[PDB]
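Bug report

Summary: structure tokens for multiple coagulation factor deficiency protein 2 differ between web form and batch submission.
Environment: batch mode, default settings.
Steps: 1) Submit the sequence below via batch. 2) Compare with the web form result.

Sequence submitted:
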Amino acid sequence: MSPQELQLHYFKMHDYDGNNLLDGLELSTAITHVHKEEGSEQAPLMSEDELINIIDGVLRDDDKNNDGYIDYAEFAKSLQ
Ligand SMILES: [Ca+2]
Ligand SMILES: [Ca+2]
């Protein structure tokens, strides 16, 4: 897919609730891409547990609004 829609890909990746937000439960699949650590769009499958903290790092830091979820504008900033 193309990067632009791939942003919505990170959104729909685990958003089966349509609340326009992603909790860690959702983000467990998505943040593997969104939280670019040792890569850009590529999933840095380095260590699942470290990746868990990476996911936390999203809900704790990449979440700029302190809501604990990642919105389109949030992950857009995070993946770019
Ligand atoms: Ca959701
Ligand atoms: Ca948020």
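Above is the batch result. After comparison, the two runs are identical; trailing whitespace caused the diff. The domain at 1-80 is CATH 1.10.238.10 (Recoverin; domain 1). The helical segments are 3-12, 24-34, 48-62, 72-79.
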